[PDB]
Symmetry: D2
Subunit: 508 residues, 4 copies
């Protein structure tokens, strides 16, 4: 009955999962909330069960995490990095089976499930180096006998709320950075990826316990919106990193602002690719396909708007069509598959509604647009032509593989059309024009947090800060100085003299 | 005759271009179709001059003109924008004494502090000029052959700036100089009771812009009250809103800006503590506490309001503080060598009396001061209260009045906790010679504030570092370090200059 | 017969100059060495005289500079920055008359003279900001109870030797940066630009004295090779910044290394411009003209090699010839003059020798190649085609306006030819190809300190670090973190605890 | 008679060592130069033999390294970091046996041998993070339509000459950083630690080979002064990093400067500890012992001068004497051993000469001063009192455990006494005075590259740049932005417009 109780899936026990799993970890495993069953999206069969957090579970866990912080903040940052390095090795030891679980419970293809674990592994290695580097400048005081220094210290407890579509890597990016910065973490993942959240936490818990560290340093409280909301309102959650829908994210942002907390918001995108007349069409067509259909269109960075110069529009559309027809559909863990199911049946319903609404707004389905007749949550990847750039359905983010195609003529209007949506995550132009590229990157260019040239909207690397502007929420994760969001800055002046000169020469 | 600006002894006000009635809207053009306000001298309760504030149409027209000017301003390279800011710096230098005198007249702080406040603006202009050659991000090594990876920084657009009465020049200036070199345009709304100062500052800046053939709306002014501030917080065209003011109002500003996914920079109240350990140099403690507590008549966000003294030295420090308080020269604040001026409004005087009375109700002892002074203007005695518990309600209330609550302590850990227990988190100071204690105060179990000082008072930051607080102080930073990043938007940019398309994390998709 | 005594040169007195000028400043003005007369290269007439430094002058000045350092290093960097700001203002007030002196004594046209002073003004502005910023990171120690910080402190006395061709801005860039970093300076300029060194030193001296600072913070000892050799051997000169010829610079570098001092070497260039087949020729032709004939070809960053793709070589050469013919020649202070004299008579002999050797090596002089028949050191700007890329004359740096033009076909061979010389100062390519640009900026591209795209090889802005690789000497000036060359780094670990955790977990007890 | 042929030392074969080993590696192993035998300094028995490089070997190896660079420089820096990370893992796998070999062939005790490999491991970790970080700023050009960027690129071939006393960690610090910066390396170690050089090179060669990279990326040419001099004069060695004697390093710097190459010089120190009257004597005494007798006084950072305030001089000396007596002498692999032999018999001769000269200069040997009666190069750790601060013998760098102890009265004079020597590496004060600590760190304080408070002169951590000033030569290794010495800076202006504005507004 349960897939975990079948021999074809026995590899699941290599992650320590069983028929019913505790979904609270705070140094002890438990869970007194409702028992959830998660299902495989490729065939709608139940996998295994997870005991979620009650409100009392949440309360005790927050309290144990903050107690653990007293020990953890006293550990020198490079020694904290050593813990994160060992997390990276423990992920390496299980990268194949953990990525297989991502494919089974979430539904993305195996190379992407494994790639998502690799992302976590890479940010661990990055964080280990950062743990010898984080800090601020010593600055020259205008005052004799005074030192001026910028200090950075952990904020305390970092709550981390993640979404279904990257159930490993977003948590990992938040976790590795927050840890070397001296914070403790509390994780609430998507309820429909509870087994993944448990498996990752099992890997981390062993590293902590092997090092005789309190496990609440990386706490887990599986649950739904009630846990998410409690975290948003909890003054003891010093920083709340939220990855999820723009609609829920706005309310998270407001609840955290109400209590003068700190939030890091990673919200939706409505990302555009723009192909100018001089673009390399050998580069445009596969870039569009990967960015539109990768992860069955379920990335925040998924290419949802394709603008093509009038001269090459019909040619690119025809070529994209013949390439969609060759997409290989099947079970996401089957090794010769490019395209798996959507994550939920609700997502199929939303996809179907968006398609029919695109038809009612005057669009033409030139490829796809049908729910597939097969077990699971499969839909056809879809191309829609003929809508105006400001069509209501086009300015809506639908987490589904629907690509809206538009004509354009001049650079100035199409830069404006890129920027006219409420979201601001990723953006790509394809062109060879040197001038046009630097204008794209400049103040009158793209307004997004990711601004790419001759590569698609998705698949960034960990060395840079990841996030967006406008309704994408403003937060950054991973690289550059994103670590600063997980710490508090102090500006510190130390008088080591016997005099008291005042700034600006004030003679009191 | 009744207006100060029409008396010959205050004729120096006209060196700032101020007249009997002044336009309070600037956007390239001077206007003001809203209410006319009269601002008053707190040292003698006489009216100074009038300002015609912004109507709603004025605000609407100014936002549009600023955003039009941004199209031109954003195309000027940063170093050339720095040259404009450098010229603003020179303009303030040439007016520093008479502008500081106006700050003393309309706001009420003493002359060395009014001049010192203009000096901060001059300092931040100098800083921003060098920064205009420096702002940007790293070129990073991509993991992909044939790709570049670069972090770009670009202006957010229109920066709205809302300021308070108690620093009517320096807070605007720190926001303005940094926002300008970062390629933003600005829209200023100051405290209505310091409207002449806002007008005078904007006349200085507008001349530099116009002399450089630039659209004046780059540094716009819309004088007005809470309805204008509320419009700025609700306006999607205001890309970043920097708000300095009360915690209560700032919380509502932050919520409104978050409601529209705007950006906000919040600089709210403090309840700042000085802590003197038993080993402290008392010859640094007593003068430092005096300046931090009675400076600006106790009306700074960074004013010391809580003084923790080790039990072994509590009585002696209190006695020496009392003797120091009695020495303070009181007078008109624009008079050189005056050390103590009036509170900004009559209401503040009443709230001073209110807090003193509540402090007595809660069991405290007024060991010095506590009364209004018998003279013209809004003068109160700088006041010292002993005997309250550290958790007394009146001691957890920011009041822009010169009242210092003094507490005893014994142990390091408890007094760090008492520093951290309040809702605000702006500034903090310990006085001690102990090396370990100092690094613990600066560390993760030490002060939770944005300013963490050792052997100096809570007030008087230099411009080279970032300025701001944590917790209910709102989290914004101004001035130094990389505070400039709050005025720009980061983008992480990958440029494929090859003929292949390898994907991150080595993912194969064919 | 001195120019300074003629009515039309009376503006020289606005710089405090007179008939015979003291060439030593250390708080007081002096000079007991040989008196030198400098001459205007536009008419070979004498301008004025400078009393140079004796050994006793040099000895007394080094001692005074190091005594002043005790005061100067105690002044907070932002307060030092305020001094540099006032130097910037005193330069702005005299920019026209100082530019004019640069034109008269050095010989570059007035816009470049004024523009060189502007460089110094610009870097003052930059340094004022830097004075609030210089320092190092606080780093996380692996040891509990320990702080780990990087401190930066001045080296002490910075000796600065400069050349004739940029007699203001190279000193200025070293000066502003060394000053905000807490160092005192000792200047020895080119003897043929002694009046410019004196006039600059007078402007700075007034600012120091006006601020009640000891004037030896910016000391001057005008002299020849004897003073520069003394500086290179002097253990009291903590950093020697030397701008000049590769030959002299190599010996300076050795002498400083012999005594374990620090040196900043800014030496010669043999800079190439490369025009690919896809280049905007409306960009190539004016860019090549400016880089090759600007300052009469006497910049270290002057373009001396021009690589043009085979397809466009003849078209570019003809357009450049037509462009050379339209250059306006005359007195460099006269309006709209774009080309003035070479700096010395010796430079004119070198110009002629290089051209003869060019034809000997098989070259073809397609334009110029002769001295002009007029007073001063005027030579025709010259274009030579037909040499191989590795001809001897083309690998030698001659401070004369001679442009060597080469054909190429493929990108990899021409990148290599850029890199094949001993110098490594500046380089430039003209192209629209996005991949070619990033390869030129990458590890298999240009090996130079300055690597440009669609602009010539000369005229840098101050925001970045300036200098070259290979025989150019490795030093950097002005922008980015060039300031670190003027300071010493310390790595400082502070135990504030009551324990002694050892690094790498070594248990030794 | 060879220890490697005794079954007692069979653990050496875990490092791939044999009776006769190849001392040249460039992807293949060889060596046509003289065969050197290295000896164990604790018993003067021969360990094994190494075939050193002939000049022909060196020429062949330089050429192969330069060709390998063309491949290596094209590998993206993060992927170069992945190679270094694997090098770090390969060292972890052999840390005990490699640490034992350091103790056997060099002579330091086992916790320090192991700890020296740990330095290398830690710098690999650090460099892995750096590999995603190295580069320069994008700057705002004053010219419209222009970009201004600071690029950093590899210099090419980095020659690395190391010394006997840290035969692993110094090479490692140079190697890990140079690798991620895109350089190839050529290593010439101390002839008397040739077996250590081969063993480290064997570990790195396996990683390179497993990753299908040319082995000459980390070349080795074992040899003496002829190889070292060829490297210093070789224009193909773009950067030469030299750790060693001040006398030899001066000639290396001159030879490199003659050819306009780059050199990084890490030379000797004459390092001082200063104990003020308010110092915690419980910190002072152990720190002085570890810093003075650690590694039998053979570190470049060894404490050789101890300045004690007059009021506490006698009590500190007496307490140090009572402590030196409890130093445990034995073989450097025997357990609980604090103190081993000197590296050579010549070092013993220099030791006796220095003790004899110190006595003739008026010093009193208050502890030690004599050769130990046992096999190997053992000498007693020695304390000398009574000398003036400028005594001739105290201003020699004798690489042996002799601590010269001086009195002082005032801060200004003893700071000057710290600074009066020719070397400028490490320095340390013990005090509680805030004002004195910040003066020591400031412009009138220590003139050294390492400036410590309440910790001794040795044992620095990898996060900061390591090196000294004055006759210590000025190079830096390891942390902060020391990576910049291994790369070349370029300032790059890109005109993406159709206009030609000149800098400073010059109209031509
Ligand atoms: O530290 C202070 O008192 C603060 C500084 C910035 C402007 C307002 N006042």
């Amino acid at each position: 009955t349960l897939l975990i109780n079948q021999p074809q899936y026995a590899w699941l026990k290599e992650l320590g999962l069983r028929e019913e799993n505790e979904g609270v970890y705070n140094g002890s495993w438990g869970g007194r909330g409702e028992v959830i069953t998660t299902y495989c999206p490729a065939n709608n069969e139940p996998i295994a069960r997870v005991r979620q957090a009650s409100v009392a579970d949440y309360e005790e866990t927050v309290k144990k995490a903050r107690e653990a912080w007293k020990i953890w903040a006293d550990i020198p940052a490079p020694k904290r990095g050593e813990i994160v390095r060992q997390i990276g090795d423990a992920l390496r030891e299980k990268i194949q089976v953990l990525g297989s679980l991502v494919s089974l419970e979430m539904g993305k293809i195996l190379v992407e499930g494994v790639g998502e674990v690799q992302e976590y592994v890479d940010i661990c290695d990055y964080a280990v180096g950062l743990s010898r580097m984080i800090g601020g400048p010593i600055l020259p005081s205008e005052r004799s006998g005074h030192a001026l220094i910028e200090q950075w210290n952990p904020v305390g407890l970092v709550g981390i709320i993640t979404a279904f579509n990257f159930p490993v890597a977003v948590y990992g990016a938040n976790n590795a950075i927050a840890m070397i910065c001296g914070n403790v973490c509390l994780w609430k993942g998507a309820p429909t990826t509870s087994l993944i959240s448990v498996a990752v936490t099992k890997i981390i818990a062993k590293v902590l316990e092997d090092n005789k560290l309190p496990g609440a340093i990386c706490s887990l409280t599986c649950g739904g919106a009630d846990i998410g909301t409690a975290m948003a309102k909890d003054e003891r959650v010093n920083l709340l990193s939220f990855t999820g829908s723009t609609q829920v994210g706005k309310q998270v942002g407001l609840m955290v602002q109400e209590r003068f907390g700190r939030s890091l918001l990673e919200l939706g995108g409505n990302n555009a690719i723009i192909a100018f007349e001089d673009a390399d069409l050998s580069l445009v067509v596969p870039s569009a396909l990967f960015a539109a259909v990768g992860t069955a269109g379920q990335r925040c960075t998924t290419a949802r708007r394709l603008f093509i110069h009038e001269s090459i529009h019909d040619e690119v559309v025809n070529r994209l069509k013949k390439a969609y027809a060759q997409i290989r559909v099947g079970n996401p863990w089957d090794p010769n598959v490019l395209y798996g199911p959507l994550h939920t049946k609700q997502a199929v319903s939303m996809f179907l509604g968006a398609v029919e609404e695109a038809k009612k707004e005057g669009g033409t389905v030139v490829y796809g647009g049908k729910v597939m007749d097969r077990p699971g949550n499969y839909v056809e990847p879809t191309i829609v032509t003929g809508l105006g750039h400001d069509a209501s359905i086009a300015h809506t983010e639908t987490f589904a593989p629907i690509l809206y195609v538009f004509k354009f003529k001049n650079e100035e209007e199409v830069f404006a059309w890129n920027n006219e949506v409420k979201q601001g995550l990723s953006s790509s132009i394809f062109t060879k024009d040197l001038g046009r590229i630097f204008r794209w990157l400049g103040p009158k260019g793209s307004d997004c947090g990711i601004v790419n040239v001759n590569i698609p909207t998705s698949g960034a690397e960990i060395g840079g800060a990841f996030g967006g502007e406008k309704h994408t929420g403003g937060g950054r994760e991973s690289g550059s100085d994103a670590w600063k969001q997980y710490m508090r800055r102090s500006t510190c002046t130390i008088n080591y003299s016997k005099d008291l000169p005042l700034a600006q020469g004030i003679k009191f």
